[PDB]
Amino acid sequence: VSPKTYKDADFYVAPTQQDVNYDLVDDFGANGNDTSDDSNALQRAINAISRKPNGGTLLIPNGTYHFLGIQMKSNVHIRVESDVIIKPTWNGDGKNHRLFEVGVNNIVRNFSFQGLGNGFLVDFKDSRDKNLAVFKLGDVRNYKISNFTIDDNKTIFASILVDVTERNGRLHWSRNGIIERIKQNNALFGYGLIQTYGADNILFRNLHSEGGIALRMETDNLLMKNYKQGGIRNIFADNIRCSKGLAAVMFGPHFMKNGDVQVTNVSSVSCGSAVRSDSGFVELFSGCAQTPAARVTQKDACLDKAKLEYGIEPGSFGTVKVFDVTARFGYNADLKQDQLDYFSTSNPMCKRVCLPTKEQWSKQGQIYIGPSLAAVIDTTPETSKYDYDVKTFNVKRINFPVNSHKTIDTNTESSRVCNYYGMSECSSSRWER
């Protein structure tokens, strides 16, 4: 097969006329030379621009700014100078925080946030806040988020949450947008750059995450389960990359029935795999039940009962095709404990696999650092009425050791060769990167 084509205008349409062009510092008094909060200045700028019928552009000039909980609005187009550094303003309330919210508490249409030149920096390195996301998207359409680097510090939450929001008794989420040219450094394994919950017609392009997963299409927001609304459809991705992480692209529908997704040009360097697909599954709340929340065993006799009794069923994806996948072998990939047994073929002595210390990660066993395992991991139940397929084309591996796996699936044999809790401890340098 040949990938479907598209043009940027199929996702985002830029304004052709605007009413104003403001500067955050000169027009709204923000200060990029101190360490004080600039949120109000930015919010006033956004509000002022959105009040104009044809909106306008806001320039965030070179300097260091502190923002938190900014509410984006319609017809606001933010451009950021190339030497800008954006840091999260300290908030000790202990709640989940985001630098920018788009359509979470309102309706946003025609919005863009783009770095000029080679992009700017969002820096979390000096933040005492571990619950940080850069963008949380909700009811927003016709948008573009582009060009910046995120210096993470293994914070909780993916940097860009393509989420759902509740309003008037139902869920709302984004449609028609482009999220591109973003690099994330030092992400926590359980997160990464993008996590998608609800989305329609979004283009993800030139995204790279060091650690975790770059494009995590793991649709598991509880709200979507309760409302039976959400999921992603007609998603396009191009040039998605992973380094020292789990995977560049991952599919994990959980309980949600998602639509079509096309991905082209996926590359990984020292990641668990380049592409990873997890089986959809069902969970019951208080050989059909797993060790408990209680996940339902992957058996069509038990699942047929699940759909009958609870009406729920394992999530899935529609037509999914991933073209041009390249996985380059490395020794610093993020690995899950249930993947370690796959070293039985190429690494029987489990060499180069480290277990992070309690200081590095309290829940020992949730993450390991070691050699890449494959180009593609697909744990979807091939022999099941409840299954979806992620078709891969032109998959290639580089520098993998002899007898390593290319594609790990449900038929792949494995055996325990690693000492789960007694293996070598990860050095600080290796964990901290």
414, HSE (Cβ side, Cα atoms, 13 Å) = 19
The helix (run of H) or strand (run of E) holding residue 431 is helix 428-432
CA distance 14 to 114: 12
Among 195, 219, 221, 380, binds Cl ion (CB under 5 A): 195
The helix (run of H) or strand (run of E) holding residue 106 is none
54, HSE (Cβ side, Cα atoms, 13 Å) = 8
78 to 42, 99, 116, 387: CA distances (angstroms): 10, 14, 10, 42
Closest to Cl ion by CB, 70 vs 188, is 188
Partner from Cl ion, Ca ion, Na ion, none binding residue 36, C-beta < 5-8 Å depending on class: Ca ion
Choices 71-79, 119-127, 194-202, 369-377; region in contact with Cl ion by CB under 5 A: 194-202
CA distance 156 to 259: 27
Partner from Na ion, Ca ion, Cl ion, none binding residue 165, C-beta < 5-8 Å depending on class: none
Q: Interaction with Cl ion in 245-264: which residues (CB under 5 A)? A: none
Does 25 engage in binding with Cl ion (CB under 5 A)? no
Is residue 307 within 8 A of residue 385, CB to CB? The reply is no
Closest to Cl ion by CB, 124 vs 157, is 157
What's the min distance (Å) between Cβ of 349 and Cl ion?
35
Which of 303, 298, 242, 230 lies closest to 270, judged by CA?
Answer: 242
Is residue 274 within 8 A of residue 248, CB to CB? The reply is yes
What's the min distance (Å) between Cβ of 409 and Ca ion?
8
Closest to Ca ion by CB, 84 vs 102, is 84
Q: Interaction with Cl ion in 151-170: which residues (CB under 5 A)? A: 157-158
Closest to Cl ion by CB, 113 vs 157, is 157
Radius of gyration for the alpha carbons in the chain, expressed in angstroms and rounded: 22
Closest to Ca ion by CB, 141 vs 321, is 321
Q: Which residue has its beta carbon closest to Cl ion?
A: 158
Total residues contacting Cl ion by CB under 5 A comes to 3
> Which residues, at least 6 apart from 222, have a Cβ–Cβ distance to it below 8 Å?
none
Residues that bind Na ion (CB under 5 A): 23, 26-27, 61, 132, 155, 157
> Which residues, at least 6 apart from 226, have a Cβ–Cβ distance to it below 8 Å?
none
CA distance 19 to 177: 23
Partner from Na ion, Cl ion, Ca ion, none binding residue 195, C-beta < 5-8 Å depending on class: Cl ion
What's the min distance (Å) between Cβ of 278 and Ca ion?
11
Partner from Cl ion, Na ion, Ca ion, none binding residue 409, C-beta < 5-8 Å depending on class: none
What's the min distance (Å) between Cβ of 115 and Na ion?
13
Residues that bind Ca ion (CB under 5 A): 31, 34, 36, 38, 82, 118, 380, 387, 389
Q: Which amino acid is at 104?
A: V
Binding site for Cl ion (CB under 5 A): 157-158, 195
